[PDB]
Structures are given as C-alpha cells and as structure tokens.
C-alpha cells in the first residue's frame with residue numbers, strides 16, 4: 427500500500443491521473459519524482475521549469491554543480507539528484523526532443539531508467555514541449571517500465587484522450 431490517490435489503473439504496474447506533477451509531489455512527497463530533463467539540466471520550461479520553480483531554484487543550483495563536475499547527460503540517460511521539498515529524490519531523465527531531431531527510439535532507453543526504482547511519480551517522457559506523441563510515449567512506458575509508475579498528466583483533455591485510446 428502507498429499514498430497515491432485517485433489514479434486509474436492501466437496495467438499491473440502503470441497508473442495514470444490528471445494532475446499537476448508539482449502539486450502531486452508536494453502532497454505525496456514520493457521517494458522518486460521524475461523530471462523531464464535535458465542533457466544540460468537546464469530546467470527552463472515544461473515539467474522541468476515547473477519542478478525547478480517549486481524548489482525556489484535549488485534544483486537548478488544543484489544541477490549546475492552536477493554538470494560542472496560530470497558534463498552533460500546522454501539522450502536516453504538519467505541521474506539521481508535531490509528531490510528538495512518535492513520528493514526524497516529526483517530522477518532527471520532525458521527523453522529525445524523531437525523539436526531537436528533526436529531519435530524517438532531513444533524513448534525506450536529513457537524509460538528503462540525507471541526500472542532502477544521500485545515506485546515513481548513521473549510525467550510522460552518526451553511529451554509536451556519535447557514534441558513526441560503522448561499516446562506513443564504511454565505505449566512505450568507500459569511496454570518498458572516494470573516497476574510501479576504513477577503518471578501525472580497536466581492537461582485534462584490529453585488525459586481523457588490517453589485513457590480512452592489505451593489498448
């Protein structure tokens with residue numbers, strides 16, 4: 427039993443809700459919240475900009491030190507950093523950005539990072555400003571992640587479309 431509330435169950439291990447991931451994180455305080463990161467951990471907009479703002483920019487300060495030490499992430503890769511006031515940990519995961527010409531096949535590699543964590547609150551990778559089809563992203567999530575994933579979908583219209591079209 428865990429504290430996630432109001433989710434629709436899609437499969438044995440994948441759950442979905444219409445929710446603001448920032449507000450969901452602040453309430454649940456999950457062990458892991460997933461950030462829709464880029465390779466530079468520049469949290470300017472989308473989910474990343476919203477998560478960072480909610481930490482009062484502490485996420486960005488920590489991220490800049492991480493990059494200065496380690497260099498950029500790989501597309502499809504991840505790193506574990508602090509969850510600040512939102513979660514114990516933040517798993518920064520880089521899905522491919524279609525608006526940058528990145529290979530969509532890397533979306534499966536991106537979701538594989540979730541399997542290193544027993545339970546996660548996450549957005550749909552490569553959705554939103556990353557330019558991928560969220561329905562596809564949901565399919566890859568279901569077919570790749572084996573650990574327990576709670577997907578927060580900000581847009582109500584999109585959430586209803588994801589549920590209604592789910593095979």
Ligand SMILES: CS(=O)(=O)NC(=O)[C@@]1(F)CN(c2ncnc3[nH]c4cc(F)ccc4c23)CC12CCC2
Nearest residue numbers: 446447462472473476549552553554555578580581
């Ligand atoms: C409109 S969207 O639904 O298409 N979402 C997108 O475009 C995104 F940019 C933003 N994302 C979020 N996901 C869950 N909670 C969220 N709270 C937020 C609060 C914000 F001020 C901004 C973004 C989010 C957000 C997902 C996304 C796809 C990959 C990044």
